[PDB]
Amino acid sequence: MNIFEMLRIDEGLRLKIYKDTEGYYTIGIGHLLTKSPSLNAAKSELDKAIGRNCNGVITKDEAEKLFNQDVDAAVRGILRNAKLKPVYDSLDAVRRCALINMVFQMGETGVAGFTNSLRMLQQKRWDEAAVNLAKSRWYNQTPNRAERVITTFRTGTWDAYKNL
């Protein structure tokens, strides 16, 4: 399994604008378009992003392009962030995927706010960190996805996704 398959499992694929778990306008593989209430602001962001008049709909190819961009941007963001980079550098490959997943979902800023959990991961205290990560709005709101990620940090294996 790899980061792309992992994220494809967690986010799904939709070719028409949709509302995400928080009510925001999204398309493709978890590509947030806008936090604005306007479907119209959404369609505008969409066309800008694709470079064509999409009228709310995109192809598989467009969805995957956006996905490539987003994953790339997530990685670079981690690498550039002073709080995240040292955590990432300290982790094994599987756990690295787990932090990427969190950043793709909640942005750099959000994950960088998980101060204590970051510290524990750095320290390789898997169990303790799993329990701290669960004490978050993140876990309460998207618990099955949160558990899958948490399990990945906990064990260092793809078990939570081998099912799926």
UniProtKB/Swiss-Prot annotation:
GO terms for biological process: cell wall macromolecule catabolic process; defense response to bacterium; peptidoglycan catabolic process; viral release from host cell by cytolysis. Gene3D superfamilies: 1.10.530.40. The keyword Metal-binding does not apply. SUPFAM superfamilies: Lysozyme-like. InterPro entries: Endolysin_T4_type, Glyco_hydro_24, Lysozyme-like_dom_sf, Lysozyme_dom_sf, Phage_lysozyme-like, T4-type_lysozyme. Substrate binds at L32, F104, S117, N132. Optimum pH is 7.3. Changing G30A: Almost complete loss of enzymatic activity. GO terms for molecular function: lysozyme activity. This is Endolysin. The gene is E.
